[PDB]
């Protein structure tokens with residue numbers, strides 16, 4: 214669709230068998246999800262933002278369904294205050310910024 | 313313009329007489345710039361980023377030139393990893409996200 218930015222661009226996603234709301238975020242290189250269970254091996258990272266850094270687990274090749282579209286990519290899991298869909302998945306949707 | 317998301321959507325802005333690089337950030341409610349000096353009075357504000365809450369200076373009705381367009385609105389100034397243009401100004405650009 215065409216999503217305006219008058220409000221937060223929040224969409225419903227399905228990941229790890231769980232349904233949740235997440236923010237379409239052009240300012241995020243990668244997708245970052247609030248603490249949840251995911252299968253497989255992971256690697257520790259530190260990612261930085263406005264309040265400083267948060268410790269996350271990096272999972273690779275995680276399928277996520279976003280607005281009825283199945284995409285796959287890197288997901289970072291940790292104590293983020295909100296679920297963020299980053300550029301690494303938005304590209305798979307063919308999502309662009311337009312003005 | 314149409315901006316794909318394979319790379320960071322960075323643009324040059326002109327603000328307070330200076331040129332700066334800034335990130336078009338749909339995950340940001342607000343526009344947040346690194347320490348700067350802007351005219352007029354400021355008001356206290358606390359914002360919550362990925363790492364926690366941060367004190368910033370809120371300046372109102374600041375003109376910024378972005379991609380050839382003049383926007384005028386609220387600018388928060390404080391410790392940020394990068395200058396971010398949030399939805400408050402992107403709406404003035406007429407920015408939308410599209411599939």
Ligand SMILES: CC(C)CN(C[C@@H](O)[C@H](Cc1ccccc1)NC(=O)O[C@H]1CO[C@H]2OCC[C@H]21)S(=O)(=O)c1ccc(C(N)=O)cc1
Nearest residue numbers: 238240241242243260261262263339340341342360361362
């Ligand atoms: C600040 C930018 C440069 C990076 N951040 C993405 C932003 O869009 C970040 C996303 C977000 C984090 C926490 C709560 C709500 C939204 N937004 C963000 O910090 O916005 C600030 C300014 O306006 C306010 O509205 C929402 C929170 C406040 S990030 O910190 O969340 C981030 C950092 C690293 C990565 C990564 N390494 O992939 C991904 C995301």
